Amino acid sequence: SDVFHLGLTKNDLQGATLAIVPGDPDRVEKIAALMDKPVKLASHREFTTWRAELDGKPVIVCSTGIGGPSTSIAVEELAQLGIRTFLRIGTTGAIQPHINVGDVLVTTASVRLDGASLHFAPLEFPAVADFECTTALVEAAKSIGATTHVGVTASSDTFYPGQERYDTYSGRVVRHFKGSMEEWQAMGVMNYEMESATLLTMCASQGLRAGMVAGVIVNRTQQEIPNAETMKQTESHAVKIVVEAARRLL
Amino acid sequence: SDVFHLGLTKNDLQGATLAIVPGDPDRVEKIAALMDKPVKLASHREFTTWRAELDGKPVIVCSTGIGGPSTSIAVEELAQLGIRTFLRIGTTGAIQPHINVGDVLVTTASVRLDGASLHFAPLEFPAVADFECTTALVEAAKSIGATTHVGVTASSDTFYPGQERYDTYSGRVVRHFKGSMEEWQAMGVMNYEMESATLLTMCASQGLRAGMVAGVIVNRTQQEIPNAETMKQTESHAVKIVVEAARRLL
Amino acid sequence: SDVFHLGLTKNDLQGATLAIVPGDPDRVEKIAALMDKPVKLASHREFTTWRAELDGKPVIVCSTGIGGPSTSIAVEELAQLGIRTFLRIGTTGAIQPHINVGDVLVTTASVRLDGASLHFAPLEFPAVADFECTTALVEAAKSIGATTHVGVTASSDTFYPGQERYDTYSGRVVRHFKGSMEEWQAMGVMNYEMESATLLTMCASQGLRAGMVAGVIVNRTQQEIPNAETMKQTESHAVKIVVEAARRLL
Amino acid sequence: SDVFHLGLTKNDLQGATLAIVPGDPDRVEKIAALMDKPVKLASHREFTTWRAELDGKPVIVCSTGIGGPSTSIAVEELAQLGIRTFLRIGTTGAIQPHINVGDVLVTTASVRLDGASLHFAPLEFPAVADFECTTALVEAAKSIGATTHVGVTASSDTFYPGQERYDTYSGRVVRHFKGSMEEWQAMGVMNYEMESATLLTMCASQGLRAGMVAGVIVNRTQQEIPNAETMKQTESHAVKIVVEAARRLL
Amino acid sequence: SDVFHLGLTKNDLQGATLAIVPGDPDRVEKIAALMDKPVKLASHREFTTWRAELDGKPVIVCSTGIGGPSTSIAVEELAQLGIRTFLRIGTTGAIQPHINVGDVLVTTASVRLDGASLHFAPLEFPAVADFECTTALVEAAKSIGATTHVGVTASSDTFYPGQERYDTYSGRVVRHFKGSMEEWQAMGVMNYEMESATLLTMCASQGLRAGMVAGVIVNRTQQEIPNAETMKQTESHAVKIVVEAARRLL
Amino acid sequence: SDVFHLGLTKNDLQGATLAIVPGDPDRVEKIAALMDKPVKLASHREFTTWRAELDGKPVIVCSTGIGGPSTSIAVEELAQLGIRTFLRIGTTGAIQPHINVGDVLVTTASVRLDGASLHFAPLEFPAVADFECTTALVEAAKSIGATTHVGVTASSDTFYPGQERYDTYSGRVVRHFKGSMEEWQAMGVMNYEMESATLLTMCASQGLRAGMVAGVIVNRTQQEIPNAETMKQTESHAVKIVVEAARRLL
């Protein structure tokens, strides 16, 4: 292996320069399966990597795991191997009433509620997505007619308090985050996720291109019993979109 | 007057919902002159406002003056009058060797080296531009074949120390900003300006659309002796681009 | 021109070392008119400069425009031209019940709710006024028997949220400033303005003397329909005071 | 499943109240294998969970994945299931010359270079380990005669810049972390890891007991070429020590 | 004198390497009186120093006065004289209902609500106690059967607002500390004191060992008329404990 | 006693409303001795209090001890007893070449390098002295012809690192303070002391008047070997000046 965690060699990528990075290792195969000649390259810790072919060009799919820390490792090591474009496809919880479960959200920039982004640039630096990737993702979503929303995303190092959830063990939320969701809502923030802040910041400040898209599997403002079928259908929609976006970025 | 500083009334705008906001009062007439039926509406403090017609639609041009403070007043009061889209057109100093004087820069997001943006959202919130406005500005630039660069901009509350200039009275730069330009350069920041951080943040967090474009009148990394001719020629192309962008946002 | 923005040359000042710096360009002539041989030197952007004579000594009057950013430019460039003493005369909104519209407030130091001051010294540095200037302003006010208050001023980069105004477009105030006015009131802060923090900090940390005086045109704690005549009368009072203070600083 | 990510139910734990939480999913089975009746309960994302019996008491082993984010999810959900004591066992890079590869380090408290801990308590709160767990870990290490060091650990949201590594793609380290390792060294910090800050803080501030132990697989101050043999042998001893510590905490 | 404030010479300590540091000068003699051959060495400002013998070894007792500032001076100068181990014995106000007046609290680490600790290490560094000292203090308390609590302590630079007391002259508490006590309580913090944050941080980051123990003289959650006799009895208990702990650290 | 630490009752002050607060308990008697009918009221911890008569009016002299913490206790409790004006008289180390040992420094405002001031107002609030007290101190100094300097003072919670001293046990200074003295010097800061930031801030934000004066006993920029004679002679003149200032504040 040429890198410390991914268990991959430069040769494994066969010259690939673009990688699709889902948060869940389980989603990696599903994404690769949409492309040609999918092959599993490795699996270590939360990092599962597959290689596939898109329009004759080798493409990488590598899970980041949950959070900026593992994400920073995956991006850095993939970059060490030649990857220059990263497209994240994940799941998210919307916080706006007009956004529905099943909708696809494209992040223009993220509210930095993470710690890793700070290891690449001070807080004042914007966790903004690459313009070409965002455009490709937007066009891709439009190509299949998906209900899409484009805007700001709150990226939290936490699934519970940072996203102001009280249905927890302690049932408390530290002062800094009390009433934080309502604030983000008033500011027009579309959703909560846990890797975009780190991904976009580290890429934007290091000459790497990054895009971010996620399917809504829950809406914090509208109570409704989760539909597993709907979730699977949503993830499928987003996956088709991230792959189609990758085609435009080759 | 219906607002505290601009000396304007709701009717003066005749239903206008988009405003072009240059930093210099002197540039307002030049911008309006490119459109139809240009009329001067008011002039108070650093706020000079003209109204014009673009493709049959009333449009506003209002100077913000230098800095987020005066900018925040202009944006807020214009918003109080119905304006929902703001396109800033200004001048800027590039800090990348590959960017030349005369080039046009479109800001995707800004490094917040200002204080006003904090009066609308905490530092972690991204000073990101609206996707539609950015796109319009990019297309507009392409329409006339202008050499264009799209990326991050460092927006400073200061023209001198915040932009790490030492050719000053004290000849010193506070510790926080010592070696700051080199850092931004390494992070791929394209330029320094003084209003985008405030403009983009306050708009992005209040449901208002904002775009940002500026012409390069100097390159901090290139010796070169300033030329008024090309400097005014650069302002010209930028003005045309912001107007053409506005057409696509009507 | 020897400076980048003011459009002034060293020779224009005829050796002047003191400048009166109002926020509004329109007030510059009114101030100069009180002195001898008033002459307009230049007018660019929000920077309008006049020269006059006080007790046989050349004196400068230069508008800073609204906000620390434009203020920092004006002060720096005037300093580049030889100015060593700066006296700001502005308008302000009082936040104490015992202070009345028409009263004159002399700032001893300011609460730094700006961003520019940070470009000269870290937040812990006090935005304190020069002792000689403050004294001169206090004596000057007493010379004409004006009702005067001496104390701390909250200097905001914003006219609306930073001064906790809710009568706005969004009708919201970012968390950091929610309930901030009541806090300042409890701390004895006299008023809100938008340039003293930047002015005092940059001067105090660079060997330049600065004083700050403003006339009350509104009291946030006492509702009362604004009287234009009263405002004009107040500005006149403050202007006479800043000029008289300048005489004692020659 | 009774929790959102772990894919576990309350009954799966059979009343277990203590969990051993390694960072790597692969290490979970190795840890459980040292105890009685080891059974795999689930595997989802980076969360692999096994149940085993220690001195007749049910015990849980659950991987956290790399980073405070995934760690915060695992701890919270395990707590939702009844777990009240958490013992982390991991790998680490020493930064002190007197510490050797193979040595075992017990963390008394951690330098918070993470973002998740802030989602539970402000920075001033100490990321301190529970006294009983620390004691148990120390005794456990002594029981097998392992060379042990007790002290402070720097817990980073990043494997590269936060640990001031320059052998990277960008080859640069953000200003905040430039010369940071030397500073920690001078302060007596023993090592760098990536989960203790989050683990200790969230536990200490929510009435949960937490301990932290790790085996040294590299020493940043000593040249030496990595050895898989001793690296796996080190993991072995650490695993035994954390299990033995758990026995004393039942 | 070999130091600037303590008025002590290296020779005065007769090779002592451990010092007991109470906050009150008046308590110094009481502590020394429990040991052999107690002798007063000096008294300057709030620094009163006595020397005594414990199991044949010379030991120092030196008051720090109230607060991290005076504490930092005492520790530094004593260290300059050879002291390497510091055990603080003080008084404290408990904030947990289950803790009673008369109980003894051993601090594992402290919430840094002080300013001095920052002069030795950034806020992210833990104000953790030395493991050996904490252990000795715990054992010592157990040796005489004192009701003991081990945990986190909130160390404030202030006796009133920082400990959220409203029974004051202003009757107000700055925003940062409003509702702060309830937050600490929810986080399991045991008590409020005013020197541990500074003591533990400066020692932990400079290779010096420090322990912290205090007797409860009030419980903020349980109203009860103070008993002077009880207080004297409590201080006596804690003193006997700190001395006994010192014996185990020789 | 009517207060928790000072061991004083309301009646002890006989209606006094002004207090002189030196840092050293030993200096209290010296100050009182200059006035009429001096009487010792109490002595507890570092708080020594005397009462005296100045021009027929009862005046209080109370030591604060070293540091904002003990200072905040003394000021608060004295305020609880009726004191409304506080004049600090201390010793200080100058950092400007033009200031000589023996000179007297009057503080207009202080750089807040303390933690206690934050317990009364956020960092942006200025630690400014009352205008009347400052004036009185300045006039008082002039009345006896003392070489006086008026300006900003750096008030540190620490005598060593915060004042960037390297002649210490560790011989190191935390990053935050490395090169800090040179920075303050360039900003025109006159000296280093340890109580003004806390004193001025808590007074200015609570409607209490405060003044600050200190005698130079060392100049960090000038070699010179310390002299007890001139050091005590300097304390003498400063004490007289603070007393004379008090007369003008009655």
Ligand SMILES: O=P(O)(O)O[C@H]1O[C@H](CO)[C@@H](O)[C@H]1O
């Ligand atoms: O489904 P992924 O891609 O993991 O993305 C979302 O899912 C996780 C939270 O359940 C976090 O990673 C969040 O960003």
Ligand SMILES: O=P(O)(O)O[C@H]1O[C@H](CO)[C@@H](O)[C@H]1O
């Ligand atoms: O030319 P404008 O539009 O003013 O923009 C630039 O010019 C000014 C500095 O000279 C600042 O306003 C900066 O943002």
Ligand SMILES: O=P(O)(O)O[C@H]1O[C@H](CO)[C@@H](O)[C@H]1O
């Ligand atoms: O009237 P000037 O001098 O501009 O001062 C006040 O007026 C403006 C706000 O209306 C800000 O500049 C504020 O400081």
Ligand SMILES: O=P(O)(O)O[C@H]1O[C@H](CO)[C@@H](O)[C@H]1O
């Ligand atoms: O081996 P684990 O337990 O994962 O611990 C260490 O290993 C990872 C870095 O390689 C991070 O998780 C770090 O904390």
Ligand SMILES: O=P(O)(O)O[C@H]1O[C@H](CO)[C@@H](O)[C@H]1O
């Ligand atoms: O009794 P000491 O040891 O002084 O400790 C406590 O007592 C003082 C407050 O009354 C502060 O020093 C606090 O830490």
Ligand SMILES: O=P(O)(O)O[C@H]1O[C@H](CO)[C@@H](O)[C@H]1O
């Ligand atoms: O001599 P005092 O009044 O104590 O003032 C100075 O002396 C002490 C330092 O030696 C600190 O209190 C400092 O402020």
Ligand SMILES: O=c1cc[nH]c(=O)[nH]1
């Ligand atoms: O609510 C949610 C759902 C998925 N992922 C998140 O980060 N948050």
Ligand SMILES: O=c1cc[nH]c(=O)[nH]1
């Ligand atoms: O260098 C420059 C030029 C124009 N505008 C800026 O803000 N900076």
Ligand SMILES: O=c1cc[nH]c(=O)[nH]1
């Ligand atoms: O309320 C007011 C009035 C004038 N100027 C300000 O800054 N605020």
Ligand SMILES: O=c1cc[nH]c(=O)[nH]1
């Ligand atoms: O150097 C290292 C090795 C293991 N784990 C870390 O966090 N850092």
Ligand SMILES: O=c1cc[nH]c(=O)[nH]1
């Ligand atoms: O309540 C209290 C009592 C003693 N010491 C403190 O710091 N606080």
Ligand SMILES: O=c1cc[nH]c(=O)[nH]1
């Ligand atoms: O150098 C010095 C001397 C006296 N007091 C201080 O705070 N510093």
Ligand SMILES: [K+]
């Ligand atoms: K302006």
Ligand SMILES: [K+]
């Ligand atoms: K992970």
Ligand SMILES: [K+]
């Ligand atoms: K003290």
